[PDB]
Amino acid sequence: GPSVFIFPPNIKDVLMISLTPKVTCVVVDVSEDDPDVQISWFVNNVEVHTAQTQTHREDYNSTIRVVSTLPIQHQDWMSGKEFKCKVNNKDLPSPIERTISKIKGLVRAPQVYILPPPAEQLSRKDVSLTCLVVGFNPGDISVEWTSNGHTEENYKDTAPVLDSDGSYFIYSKLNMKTSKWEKTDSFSCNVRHEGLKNYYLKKTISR
Amino acid sequence: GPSVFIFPPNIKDVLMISLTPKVTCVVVDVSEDDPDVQISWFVNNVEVHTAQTQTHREDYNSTIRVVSTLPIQHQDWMSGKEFKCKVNNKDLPSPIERTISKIKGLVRAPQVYILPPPAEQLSRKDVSLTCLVVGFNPGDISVEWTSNGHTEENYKDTAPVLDSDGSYFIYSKLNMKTSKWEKTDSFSCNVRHEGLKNYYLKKTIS
Ligand SMILES: *[C@@H]1O[C@H](CO[C@@H]2O[C@@H](C)[C@@H](O)[C@@H](O)[C@@H]2O)[C@@H](O[C@@H]2O[C@H](CO)[C@@H](O[C@@H]3O[C@H](CO[C@H]4O[C@H](CO)[C@@H](O)[C@H](O)[C@@H]4O[C@@H]4O[C@H](CO)[C@@H](O[C@@H]5O[C@H](CO)[C@H](O)[C@H](O)[C@H]5O)[C@H](O)[C@H]4NC(C)=O)[C@@H](O)[C@H](O[C@H]4O[C@H](CO)[C@@H](O)[C@H](O)[C@@H]4O[C@@H]4O[C@H](CO)[C@@H](O)[C@H](O)[C@H]4NC(C)=O)[C@@H]3O)[C@H](O)[C@H]2NC(C)=O)[C@H](O)[C@H]1NC(C)=O
Ligand SMILES: *[C@@H]1O[C@H](CO[C@@H]2O[C@@H](C)[C@@H](O)[C@@H](O)[C@@H]2O)[C@@H](O[C@@H]2O[C@H](CO)[C@@H](O[C@@H]3O[C@H](CO[C@H]4O[C@H](CO)[C@@H](O)[C@H](O)[C@@H]4O[C@@H]4O[C@H](CO)[C@@H](O[C@@H]5O[C@H](CO)[C@H](O)[C@H](O)[C@H]5O)[C@H](O)[C@H]4NC(C)=O)[C@@H](O)[C@H](O[C@H]4O[C@H](CO)[C@@H](O)[C@H](O)[C@@H]4O[C@@H]4O[C@H](CO)[C@@H](O)[C@H](O)[C@H]4NC(C)=O)[C@@H]3O)[C@H](O)[C@H]2NC(C)=O)[C@H](O)[C@H]1NC(C)=O
């Protein structure tokens, strides 16, 4: 039968008032013979009808995939409301329910550091610039890169990792040809985390 | 009913001839009223009786957990033999089978770099020393820390991450007092990966 997964809003959406946070319920392994899936959503056990639901055939493994996206209020996520999807399909004996909420806990702001490329890397044609964000709880965080107020897209973050001291760290790695690294006036590590004043810190490394 | 998960040997065991690599089959959500589970193992579809199997009650969630550990030959893993567990329990309509093997692929050796603690951290009482291992395939790697032949245990690695160029990177973070950093003669990042000459490279910093 079908499996249902529920996913939280993206922390960047949660932490910026101009963006819309969304809870996601994904149904996989739906049969092509029984494609109809009914998804109901609840906020604190009250039914809401604000979700958008898309259905798609996964041609690569002969199943249907349904995705429902519930837009939510920042205040409801932050205050700990429970967001619940309920899924009905012919292949299902009883409806499947999933619920999710922000779990209350310890809050601690990250320290943000930028580490330049290692000397041994500078003779190469490409270099990596590292942002180390350490000491934060909880381990939901957004790290993005810019260059002089221009968006940089060639970077990868690690997952947040539980450190020995009970907090989290994450490393972000921006990749660039060595000539950009010399040519450029500054680079910035843009960190969004609920532990931070104004939910935002920027750290810059200037030529 | 019960569910079964299968796990590969540790990459360090695979890459050191003196260590025994092990395939692990774990059965969870076994009922307390039917604890008996039969696990059989197969290497390329021929049955072996070399595994050690342990059962334990999980008191925190009222279920039985069974762990079968199959010791394997390095060459068997490396040459791509399939290792298979078959699990029987009274709560299974039919036996559950899981199989694993080393997947064949490109091999690329990592570059290893060590980055000193960031300048703004030197003012604090604890510092972070970073090993950046980058440019490797496949994404199975061992990274460990020493100082002067001494084992350092206060470090955490990230999992390997698939990079922009199709290769993997990992970061390893060694935590220590600022004094230790300033007084210690050397720190070494010890990397084990199948792309490396002798499956081993050590980078060292002062
Ligand atoms: C047929 O194919 C489909 C599709 O697969 C795709 O196509 C095929 C052909 C292949 O190419 C394949 O590689 C392709 O992916 C298959 O569908 C897959 O099915 C499996 C289940 O069989 C699903 O596995 C679960 O994955 C969860 C994690 O999923 C995320 O991360 C994975 C890993 O990368 C991604 O692949 C997924 O897409 C998910 O990614 C997330 O997606 C979110 C929703 O979109 C994103 O959030 C949204 O993002 C947007 C922006 O994009 C907005 O911001 C929204 O606001 C936001 O909501 C999110 O960003 C994104 N993240 C990432 C990383 O990109 C696992 O969590 C889950 O594990 C749980 O469940 C298991 C039970 O099955 C259980 O064993 C685990 O232990 C775990 O259980 C949970 O554990 C905790 C305790 O720790 C408990 O609290 C829970 O209750 C507990 N649950 C239970 C009940 O025990 C699964 O591993 C897989 O996700 C799914 N893929 C896709 C793409 O949907 C299908 O299987 C194929 N069928 C056949 C027959 O072969
Ligand atoms: C009752 O409790 C038990 C026990 O849980 C514990 O106690 C409870 C009370 C809680 O406190 C809890 O927090 C505790 O953990 C519960 O048991 C759990 O059940 C879930 C599913 O219900 C299992 O989830 C799967 O996890 C896999 C990953 O497992 C590792 O990682 C987690 C977290 O990091 C660890 O907790 C686990 O222990 C696993 O850790 C690994 O264990 C290995 C073997 O022991 C180690 O390797 C060995 O290492 C030793 C050294 O020690 C030697 O070196 C050996 O040589 C070596 O072999 C290994 O190092 C270690 N790693 C780490 C990081 O520690 C997931 O892979 C898996 O996902 C798959 O399956 C899902 C199906 O359910 C599916 O949805 C997913 O999509 C995914 O599916 C597969 O995807 C792959 C690609 O990855 C595809 O190729 C496949 O096709 C596809 N298959 C399928 C079928 O679709 C699950 O998420 C969980 O592992 C298990 N925990 C334990 C401890 O056993 C139980 O659920 C509870 N019951 C109830 C009702 O509450």
Structural domain boundaries of chain A? 2-101, 102-207
Confirm or reject contact between B80 and chain A (CB < 8 A): no
Contact list, A161 vs chain B (CB under 8 Å): 156, 158
On whether any CB of chain A is under 8 Å from the CB of B205, the answer is: no
Q: Which residue has a Cα nearest atom 63 of ligand 1?
A: A7
CA distance B126 to A167: 14
Q: Which residues pair with A113 in a beta bridge?
A: A132
Q: Is A22 in the pocket of ligand 1 (CB under 6 A)?
A: yes
Q: Could you give the 3-state DSSP secondary structure of residue B167?
A: coil
Give the class (CATH, top level) of B102-206: mainly beta
For strand B52-58 and strand A96-100, is the pairing parallel, antiparallel, or unpaired? Answer: unpaired
CB proximity B169 to A under 8 Å: yes
- Strands of A38-43's sheet, edge to edge? A46-48, A38-43, A83-88, A96-100
Whether B2-101 shares its CATH topology with B102-206 is answered yes
Spatial CA neighbour of A169 closest among A117, A113, A125: A113
Q: Which residues contact A39 (CB under 8 A, 6 or more apart)?
A: A25, A27, A51, A53, A66, A68, A85, A86, A87, A88
Ligand 1, atom 41, residue with closest C-alpha: A7
DSSP code, position A8: P
The helix/strand count (H/E) of chain B reads as 3, 17
DSSP string, A97-138: EEEE-PPP---BPPEEEEEPPPGGGTTSSEEEEEEEEEEEBS
Sign, Cα dihedral of B46, B47, B50, B54: positive
Coil, strand or helix at A10:
coil
Instruction: Centre a 10 Å sphere on the Cβ of residue B74 and count the other Cβ atoms it contains.
Output: 16
Q: Read off the amino acid at residue B82.
A: E
Tell me which chain B residue has its CA closest to the CA of residue A155: B164
A72 CA distance to ligand 1 centroid (A)?
Answer: 21
Reading the block at residue A81, the tokens are 């409301």
Nearest CA in chain A to B121: A113
Question: To what resolution in angstroms was this structure determined?
Answer: 2.1
**At the fourth CATH level, which superfamily is domain B2-101?**
Immunoglobulins (2.60.40.10)
Give the CA diameter of chain A.
Answer: 64
Residue whose CA is at the smallest distance from ligand 1 atom 57: A9
Do B130 and A132 lie within an 8 Å CB cutoff?
A: yes
Whether B48 and B68 have beta carbons less than 8 Å apart is answered as: no
The highest-level CATH class for domain A102-207 is: mainly beta
Distance of alpha carbon B64 from alpha carbon B55, whole angstroms: 7
Looking at the partner chain, which of B158, B165, B175 has a beta carbon nearest the beta carbon of A171? B158
**Short-list A72, A71, A85, A83, CA closest to A2:** A85
Gap from B19 CA to chain A (nearest CA, Å) = 27
